[PDB]
Amino acid sequence: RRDWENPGVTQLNRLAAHPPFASWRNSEEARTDRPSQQLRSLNGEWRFAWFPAPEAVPESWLECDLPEADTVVVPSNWQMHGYDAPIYTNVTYPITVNPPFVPTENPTGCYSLTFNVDESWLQEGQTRIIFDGVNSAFHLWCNGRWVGYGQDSRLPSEFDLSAFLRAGENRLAVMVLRWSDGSYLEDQDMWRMSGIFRDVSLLHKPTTQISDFHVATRFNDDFSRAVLEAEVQMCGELRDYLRVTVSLWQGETQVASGTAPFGGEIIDERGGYADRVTLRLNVENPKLWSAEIPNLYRAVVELHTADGTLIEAEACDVGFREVRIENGLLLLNGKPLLIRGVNRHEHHPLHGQVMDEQTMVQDILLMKQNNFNAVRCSHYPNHPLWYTLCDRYGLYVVDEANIETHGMVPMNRLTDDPRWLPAMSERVTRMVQRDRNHPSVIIWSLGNESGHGANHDALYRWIKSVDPSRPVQYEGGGADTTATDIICPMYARVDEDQPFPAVPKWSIKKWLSLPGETRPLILCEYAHAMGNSLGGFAKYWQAFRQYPRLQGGFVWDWVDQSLIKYDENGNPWSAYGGDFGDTPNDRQFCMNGLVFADRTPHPALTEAKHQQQFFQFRLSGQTIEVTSEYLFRHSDNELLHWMVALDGKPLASGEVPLDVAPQGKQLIELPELPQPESAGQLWLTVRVVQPNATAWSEAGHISAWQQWRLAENLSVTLPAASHAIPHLTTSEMDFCIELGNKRWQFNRQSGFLSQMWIGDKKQLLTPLRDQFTRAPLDNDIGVSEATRIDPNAWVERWKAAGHYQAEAALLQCTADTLADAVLITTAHAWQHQGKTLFISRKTYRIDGSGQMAITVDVEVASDTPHPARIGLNCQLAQVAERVNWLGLGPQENYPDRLTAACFDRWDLPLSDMYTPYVFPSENGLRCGTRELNYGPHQWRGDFQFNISRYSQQQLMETSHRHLLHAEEGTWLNIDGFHMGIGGDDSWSPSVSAEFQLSAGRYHYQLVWCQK
Amino acid sequence: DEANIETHGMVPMNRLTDDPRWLPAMSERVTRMVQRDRNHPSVIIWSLGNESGHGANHDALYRWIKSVDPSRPVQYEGGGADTTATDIICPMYARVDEDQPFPAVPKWSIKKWLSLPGETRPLILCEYAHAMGNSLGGFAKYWQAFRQYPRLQGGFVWDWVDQSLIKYDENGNPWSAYGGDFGDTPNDRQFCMNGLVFADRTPH
Amino acid sequence: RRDWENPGVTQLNRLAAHPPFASWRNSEEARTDRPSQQLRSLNGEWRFAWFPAPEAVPESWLECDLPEADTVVVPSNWQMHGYDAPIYTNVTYPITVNPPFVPTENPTGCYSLTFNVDESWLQEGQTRIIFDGVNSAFHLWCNGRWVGYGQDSRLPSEFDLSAFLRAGENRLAVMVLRWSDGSYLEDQDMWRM
Ligand SMILES: *[C@@H]1C[C@@H](O)[C@@H](O)[C@@H](CO)O1
Ligand SMILES: *[C@@H]1C[C@@H](O)[C@@H](O)[C@@H](CO)O1
Ligand SMILES: [Mg+2]
Ligand SMILES: [Mg+2]
Ligand SMILES: [Mg+2]
Ligand SMILES: [Mg+2]
Ligand code: NA
Ligand code: NA
Ligand code: NA
Ligand code: NA
Ligand code: NA
Ligand code: NA
């Protein structure tokens, strides 16, 4: 049969999909959501053997364990146990595109289990097995007898074992195929693995049972009244004595309850459903569910007899909320949302695609703590627990069918084909059938990157028809097709259009008002966070707040998909595409998250948190106007804290509880600001602090901040009389300046400061030289490959221009003595292939005080590509424990990604000044710095810097962080100007014009002195 | 041109058509027809089938066609004759002046049906003037209404030819037989004979 | 497999649907809609045998004519040849309502045909068989080897026989089921044949 190469056969003997069941036989346990004796986990130790193809599997295996098999933990992805290599390919299918066929060599996972079954489960009722996740297709045998077949690696497949089991010891046999016709619809950009990777369980239901139930909540005009409607279906023999009671609870209080026999209303000429019944419960003043306040009730549905004998009970958490699109806006409980979303894959650096509650909770808490309120299940239905958690913790969820055919050419080749309709359909219908009762799901998604085909329009309608309660969305085919209620592009820019033919990405602002367009636009993906990215994030936040119909988006994405590998010494390191011998592969493209695989945040996360703050501020005079962006709750767990500091030195501060209604404003007058004695700039910082712990945060949690410069007092204070005069020593080859026990040497042929001594201690390992390039970022690189250059990428433009190859030719090097100083003057050209790319002119004024004042003026040929930076660099001989500075921090920050950073006095261990991106590149910059301290040195001015043990050269020659080695001394990069990092997407130039170094002529000044 | 989908015998009528598990089988009966017949100019309208209630599978299917072949309207009478799965109000047996307010699926007078609040589609009966036996009494009343009302655009009489079959007597002479004449049970006797013409084409 | 009791399986190995074709190798003929030598009719006399259930069908049939068979015209409805009764039921299903199951006594019509294929058809190209109407489901074999399966008694079911015929005499065997899960979608007010 090769059922695995036939999309017309997606399963055999599989039971209907339904909401989460547990078959409680006690109503209070169902009420309390306690573990059910009728629902058992078979997770644990199973038997496993790997085969190269289904054909190589021995018949024997069906009746008995293969000696050669191993004992392994289930759930798991067999690649994570080393049986075979996980593959990381983005768009290109990991198998030849020749649908519906798959390779003859098809890795086969044979799992088996010997377990007990109680007679009580067999003497009556129905016993079924549930495979929550099997990637990608499988055959099931029970006690050597064939049961059935299942496809769709992202939804549970259930089978009735009733007739196959026997009291006592039983044997399950599971043959899992790595590739199947289903893989054609599973082309998501992530690691390609296989196995039984989600839960395995046994569920017992009575023969007369609840076979399905739908819970709906509808409201009056101002949501002060609701009707809970519960449609219940049964299976088994109908009898007049059967009844269904549905009861609604608010904690221990029973809110409402309705009982009725089966027999629904007339549907058509043939009657109604004798096997269903709809209970209707009235609820006054329901407590509404929202990401802000996730209030839930509990619905308990009891199947029982007229005398009161309980047969069984099913149950769910219910959130009272209404989702609707009205007048072009997506409303929740009647208010327009502002989605602070993120896409999130099910990924664990050690367990691969196996999800545990701990990691789930970890993610949800970080998310909330970081001001996210929404999540998109990229790109398949999630492990069941995910929904319980979102319901309870409060996240708006986009549930998405497991459908992605990116690999086809054109992309809708399979989706526009009626022969793939059925397969696609089940991916949609079974998702709905499973998740329809979770309040956290507020939107349905047709899947991802499958172009736009007719099957999509058909599927869009089915849903709208069966569940009018949630909008349907879908990005394929241009993001605004007839298959979507929401304009939901991926990587559309704020202001700049990308008019691709057939599927342009318009500026979002512009897309809204295209002729005839009226829908809401919420990006399904934006601000691609690969490496040192998120450049321009604020720009999205500013347009979302200004335009009502711009309702947010989903950042791409939450966590890097890196895998843990171990070196010969047994140490672990983070691996990406190709690191397993997988080819072809897409290397680092699997690492696009705000947090590392291990949950440690990337610097970008803080930028996200600050822009997604729910409190907005304005300052006027001594007045601070705080506006709440909450739609439902009052600022009941917030205090505003403020502080005024002169150049990092605290002058005053204070606190005020916030008491602002959702969308309201609150004015706070600051007390008169005592004048200040001394030059410097006053800065006002405010912080929103939650005094009390919550289900998602700890007491003290800071939820928002903002700063403003206040008055500045310029220094006009004339220095002071130098106790000494520096001496100049002129030689053939060098200009030397000596002052006290300090010495500086400027080489005459190079034109650079090559050595500086403190006493007899040399301070430099490499001379102080201009620097115009940076170890390319992921964004600079784009998709360019040595194997296939992308001439338009930033890195390729710089290469080709000779930026990395350009060498300093000296034009001038003079020394002059002034009244109290020695002045060195130098001029250097950087050329390549006869073209002058940059010209740097400087002065070094060393004075009586030992301060070295450096002035830098640079010219950039207009026709050369704009450089990554314009700074100086050097390798210091010393290494120091801390880095102290006066400027923006404390975390890494770049021009287009510095909003979250605060101007203040920061002090960190040197290592915190390096950002360990898996794929190394320029990193650790801090901008707007007025003073930098390292060891005995201090640099003063208005610059950008990074300090670390790694040169830019090493960084750029190194592809994996674990392979970096600290060099001798400390590498210091001090930039007058640095280019923005971009990130609108990571495969095409994305740095906004305003962040390019295009002025042509640049000036900066610096003071290097000892402390 | 109508898909080969009729599940009249289910209780309620849309038991299968509202069942996703049945969406695939159904889809192929709809998509295969279109793929085959979409180039015939004579086909001016697509039909989703007959007497299978109104199910979500119908809405889905309706949309598919709308998408793939916008050159022709889609009609379907199940579940009320005016659901979201039909471009045309296409009841069977609705009367001219007389309403038949059955629950869930009333059969309004045709004239009245067109102006129900919010209604704007054209109305063309998928079935009317049941010609069984000595029938067609009140035929002119439909024509009078179709001519006077722009949106009453006609209908399809039920039906063309008696489904009677030939049998031989002991003498070998032929005779017209209907339901039950073959030992078939249960059967619906003469209900299979409702044509304007006899099984050999002679006119009634 | 009991393919006829599973709405999840409506065909096996069937070719995509498409508008009428004739593969003319002459453009003037195509213009005038003249008969095409590439489109051959198999209509006429076939061998048919009737059974009460698919289980009653003997294996022998697959490779060899049943001496017990009759010669009958095709196309036809077997009720009209007297092998069984046609049923006139309006609304009530002629079979017990228990989707997607059907009765175990299920009239089975075993059609076969021996016919010739010229080498020319086999040296190059593709040879398909087209069944325009088969009520209500069937399995097809060619030269004793299984080819495919199909349902929907009112659309053409097509299969590639390219890899199964040989120059000269060939044998088709078609097992036709009266009732199938497709019968659930075929409850029209008319004779059940
Ligand atoms: C959006 C779709 C997602 O699966 C990723 O491919 C992302 C790019 O890294 O784009
Ligand atoms: C409309 C449907 C058709 O097939 C017949 O049942 C007719 C009455 O004879 O009504
Ligand atoms: Mg398959
Ligand atoms: Mg993709
Ligand atoms: Mg079937
Ligand atoms: Mg009927
Ligand atoms: Na907005
Ligand atoms: Na990616
Ligand atoms: Na407060
Ligand atoms: Na690198
Ligand atoms: Na008219
Ligand atoms: Na009739």
From Swiss-Prot, chain B:
This is Beta-galactosidase. Belongs to the glycosyl hydrolase 2 family. Substrate binds at residues 51, 127-130, 194. Mg(2+) 2 binds at residue 187. The active site is at residues 51, 127. Changing residue 51 to H: Slowly inactivates galactosidase activity by reducing the binding of magnesium. It increases binding specificity. Induction: By allolactose. The chain holds residues 412 to 615 of 1024 of the full protein. Mg(2+) 1 binds at residues 6, 8, 51. Changing residue 191 to A: Decreases the stability of the loop 794-804. Homotetramer. Na(+) binds at residues 191, 194.
Swiss-Prot record, chain C:
This is Beta-galactosidase. Homotetramer. Substrate binds at residues 90, 189. Na(+) binds at residue 189. The chain holds residues 14 to 206 of 1024 of the full protein. The gene is lacZ. Signal peptide: none annotated. Belongs to the glycosyl hydrolase 2 family. Induction: By allolactose.
